C-alpha cells in the first residue's frame, strides 16, 4: 500500500522504494486510518443507484477492516430483506459491528426479491463502513455508507486534525425495480431518481397535513 | 470534487479527560467522538480522494491473501516496512541509503585537530 | 528424504494484476494462488525438513502460554526480537555488538587532515 504524509499543508505520497531522510515519525498517534465518503465527489447518492451500485456472488469469504476517523454523512443506508418465500437475503450483523454513528439522512429500506446467493458487494469494489469498521459486505438491520480508506501520518503541529426514511424493494434491479417510499401502510409514493431527501421530507409533511395510497408529482453537489 | 472537509475523528487524544474514562460512567455510544472541519488548502483533499480511489486496488489485493476477518495489524506492518526500508540490518552512513546526519561531527573533529 | 520440491505459494506478489483484484470479479477460491518447483541444491530442502521437525517443539511451547486461537502476530514478534537483539536502546559502534560500518569514515577524516 502507499502512504501519504502531511507537510506544510501539502501532501506527499511516499513511494515505497524511495528514501526520505527528511521524514519524521514520533508515534502511532501521528498515524491515522481514515474512511471517506462518496459524497464529496458528486456521485449519485440516491436509493435506485444504491441498488445499482451492488451485486451478489458466493464462494468468497467475508473481509473486514478497522478505521479510526472519517467524514460526516449526508446520506446512509440500511436493509432488512428476505426472498419471495419470506426467507432471509443477507448475513447477520455480528457483535461489535454497529450502525455508522453519523447520518444526516437514512435511506432505510425493506422488501424482498430473488436475492441470488452470495453477498452484497459493490460494483467498483468499494467498502461498507460501520462503527469504526468497514468491509465489503452488508449485514442486516445496520446503518453504513459506501466509502474508501486512507492511511496517513500527521506532524506534531497544533491543529488536532436526525432523520429516518422507509422504502420497499421490488425484485432488486433485475433490469427492474419499482421503489416506493412509505408514509404509512395506506400511503406510498412512486420514488423518482433525481428527487432529494429534502424534497421528500416536504412531501411527507404536506401530505401529513392533507389527511395522510400511491401518488406522483406529475412534473449537483449540495455544498453550494 | 468537494473542497470542503466537514470531517470527524474519535475522542482518543491524550489530555481531554478528568475521570469520565470509567466504563459505565461514560457514553460508549455517541459521546466518545470528535468532529472538525477544514477547507481545501492547495487542492489537498481532492488529491487524497484521488489517492484513496487509487489505493483500493492494492488494498484489496494485499488483503486477499489471508483468511482473517477483522484486520488490525496492517498499520504496524506498514511502519515496520518503513523501518526495514530504513534499516535492513546494515547501514552505510556515506552510502546515501541509511539517512543519518553525521556531517557536523567534523566540527568537533576540527576542534580537536586545532588542539 | 525427498530432494524434490514441487511446491506452491499464494499469489500475493506485487505487479501481477490489472484490475482483477475486484472481489467478486475474482476467484477467491482456487485462482488466488501460485505454484513452483525446485531441486535439492546443496541438501538444502532436506536440511530444512530436519529444521522443521526440530522447530515443532519450541513452537508448541512458545504457543502454549496464551489462550488465543488463531495466531497471526508471531512473525512480527520474531522480527522485533531480531531488532532488539540488534537494538536494545544503546549502541557501541566499536563494541562489536551494534553492527554498523563506520570504518570508511576515516577516509574523509584523513582527507580533512591532509587539508
Amino acid at each position, epitope marked *: 500500500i502507499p502512504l501519504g504524509v502531511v507537510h506544510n499543508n501539502t501532501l506527499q505520497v511516499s513511494d515505497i522504494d524511495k528514501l526520505v531522510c527528511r521524514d519524521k515519525l514520533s508515534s502511532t498517534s501521528q498515524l491515522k486510518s481514515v474512511g471517506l465518503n462518496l459524497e464529496g465527489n458528486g456521485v449519485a447518492t440516491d436509493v435506485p443507484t444504491a441498488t445499482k451500485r451492488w451485486g451478489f456472488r458466493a464462494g468468497v469469504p467475508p473481509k473486514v477492516v478497522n478505521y479510526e476517523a472519517g467524514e460526516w454523512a449526508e446520506n446512509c443506508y440500511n436493509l432488512d430483506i428476505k426472498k419471495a418465500d419470506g426467507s432471509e437475503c443477507l448475513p447477520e450483523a455480528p457483535e461489535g459491528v454497529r450502525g455508522f454513528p453519523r447520518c444526516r439522512y437514512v435511506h432505510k429500506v425493506s422488501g424482498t426479491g430473488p436475492c441470488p446467493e452470495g453477498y452484497a458487494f459493490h460494483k467498483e469494489g468499494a467498502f461498507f463502513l460501520y462503527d469504526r469498521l468497514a468491509s465489503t459486505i452488508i449485514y442486516r438491520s445496520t446503518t453504513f455508507s459506501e466509502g474508501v480508506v486512507a492511511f496517513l501520518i500527521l506532524p506534531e503541529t497544533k491543529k488536532d486534525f436526525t432523520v429516518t426514511l422507509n422504502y420497499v424493494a421490488d425484485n432488486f434491479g433485475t433490469n427492474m425495480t419499482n421503489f416506493l417510499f412509505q408514509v404509512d401502510h395506506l400511503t406510498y409514493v412512486q420514488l423518482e431518481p433525481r428527487f432529494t431527501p429534502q424534497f421528500l421530507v416536504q412531501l411527507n409533511e404536506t401530505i401529513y397535513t392533507n389527511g395522510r395510497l400511491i401518488w406522483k408529482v406529475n412534473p449537483w453537489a449540495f455544498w453550494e | 470534487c468537494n473542497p470542503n472537509l466537514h470531517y470527524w475523528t474519535t475522542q482518543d487524544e491524550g489530555a481531554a479527560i478528568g475521570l469520565a474514562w470509567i466504563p459505565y460512567f461514560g457514553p460508549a455510544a455517541e459521546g466518545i467522538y470528535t468532529e472538525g472541519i477544514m477547507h481545501n488548502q492547495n487542492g489537498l483533499i481532492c*488529491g487524497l480522494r484521488q489517492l484513496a480511489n487509487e489505493t483500493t*486496488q492494492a488494498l484489496q489485493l494485499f488483503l486477499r491473501a489471508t483468511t482473517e476477518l477483522r484486520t488490525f495489524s496492517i498499520l504496524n506492518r506498514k511502519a515496520i516496512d518503513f523501518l526495514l526500508q530504513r534499516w535492513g540490518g546494515t547501514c552505510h552512513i556515506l552510502g546515501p541509503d541509511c539517512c543519518i546526519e553525521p556531517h557536523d561531527w567534523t566540527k568537533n573533529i576540527t576542534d580537536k585537530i586545532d588542539q | 528424504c525427498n530432494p524434490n520440491l514441487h511446491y506452491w505459494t499464494t499469489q500475493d506478489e506485487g505487479a501481477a494484476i490489472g484490475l*482483477a483484484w475486484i472481489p467478486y*470479479f475474482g476467484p477467491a477460491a482456487e485462482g488466488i494462488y501460485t505454484e513452483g518447483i525446485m531441486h535439492n541444491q546443496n541438501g538444502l530442502i532436506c536440511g530444512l525438513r530436519q529444521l522443521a521437525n526440530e522447530t515443532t517443539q519450541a513452537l508448541q511451547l512458545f504457543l502454549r502460554a496464551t489462550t488465543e486461537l488463531r495466531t497471526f502476530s508471531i512473525l512480527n514478534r520474531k522480527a522485533i526480537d531480531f531488532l532488539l537483539q540488534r537494538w536494545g536502546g544503546t549502541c557501541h559502534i566499536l563494541g562489536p555488538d551494534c553492527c554498523i560500518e563506520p570504518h570508511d569514515w576515516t577516509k574523509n577524516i584523513t582527507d580533512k587532515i591532509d587539508q
Partner: antibody
Amino acid sequence: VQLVQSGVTLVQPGGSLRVSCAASGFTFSSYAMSWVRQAPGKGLEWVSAISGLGGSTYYADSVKGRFTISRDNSKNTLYLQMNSLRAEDTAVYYCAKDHRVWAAGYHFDYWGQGALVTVS
Amino acid sequence: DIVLTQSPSTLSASVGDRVTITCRASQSISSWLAWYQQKPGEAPKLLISDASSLESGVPSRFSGSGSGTEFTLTISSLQPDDFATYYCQQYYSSPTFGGGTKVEIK
C-alpha cells in the same frame, strides 16, 4: 491534450537511458500513465504504469527490476530510467494515458509518437 | 499468463461490406475487453471499452460484443481508412495483447 516523445536512440547492448514524455492540456496528476512496446515485425504488449501521484507503480515480468518508472506531476512530465539492454528491448515505446479518472484504470485513450529504441 | 486469440489474422474485403472479428483467450473475463486500431506506423486509438461501449470520435459503423472468454467485433460498412490494423486488448488481470487483425483487397 498533446503528448511528446523525446529521446529515441540507438544505444549499445547493456546500455541505459532515461526517456521522458511530456503532456499538456489536461489534468495530468489526475490520470495514469504507462509505457507500451511495439516490437517491429510483430504486435503489442504492456510494460509498466503508475498511480496518479507516484505512490504505486507496476511493471511487466520480462523487464521487472531492470527499469524504473518515474514521473513529475509538478512538470506533468513522465519519465523512465532504463537499465541493461538486450535485443527484444529493440522496439518502439509509447507514452499513453488511461480512460478512467484518478489514474485508477487501463484501456488507454490516446498515444504519443513512439520511439524506436534499439541496440547494436 | 493469459493469451488472447485474434481470429483471423487478416482479411480481404471491399468497401461497404459488413465484417466481423472474433477474439478469444484462455480464461473467462467479465466483458472487460477493449479494441484498438492503428496503421502502418501510426499511433493507435481507443475504440471500445468493455467490448460494448464505443467512444467519442468512433463511427457507429462498428459493433463490439461478447462475454466470458469469447469476444467479438462487427463492422456494418467498410471504409478505406477502416482497412487498417485492429487489436484485441485484455485488461482483466495481465493487461496484455495478442497478434492483431488486418484488412485487404484483391
